[PDB]
Amino acid sequence: DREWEKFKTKHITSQSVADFNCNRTMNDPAYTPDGQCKPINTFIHSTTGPVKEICRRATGRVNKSSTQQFTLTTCKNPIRCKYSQSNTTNFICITCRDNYPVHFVKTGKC
Ligand SMILES: *[C@@H]1O[C@H](CO)[C@@H](O[C@@H]2O[C@H](CO)[C@@H](O)[C@H](O)[C@H]2NC(C)=O)[C@H](O)[C@H]1NC(C)=O
Numbered sequence: 001d002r003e004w005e006k007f008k009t010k011h012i013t014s015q016s017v018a019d020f021n022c023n024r025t026m027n028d029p030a031y032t033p034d035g036q037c038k039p040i041n042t043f044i045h046s047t048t049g050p051v052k053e054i055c056r057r058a059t060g061r062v063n064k065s066s067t068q069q070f071t072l073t074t075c076k077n078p079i080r081c082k083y084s085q086s087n088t089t090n091f092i093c094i095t096c097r098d099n100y101p102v103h104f105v106k107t108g109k110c
Pocket residue numbers: 020021022023082083084085
């Protein structure tokens with residue numbers, strides 16, 4: 001699924017919180033479908049399956065809150081494409097297209 005693939009690329013990372021570097025990834029064409037050096041993005045430190053599970057009971061395009069918490073790195077406030085980095089554990093709010101996550105809405109419950 002195209003939308004799912006884009007979501008995984010843009011928001012899911014197999015990197016650890018410590019090894020993750022916003023300055024690197026926010027400017028890495030391999031993980032920036034909507035373009036590099038964007039103002040803000042949140043990365044989910046997890047295997048893809050648990051994230052897809054968030055949409056297991058969703059029908060149509062609808063926002064869903066995850067029932068489990070994930071480790072999240074948010075890259076923001078760039079200055080010449082160099083970012084401030086923050087990490088938190090929280091639930092996430094995403095838009096599902098049936099069983100596929102397609103858009104990251106916000107950190108925490110919807
Ligand atoms: C990504 O770039 C930012 C901005 O250069 C780094 O944060 C700065 O780090 C220096 C030390 O190297 C500090 O003196 C500045 O005060 C920091 N600025 C901000 C806005 O925090 C950030 O550490 C870099 N990311 C990584 C993983 O090294």
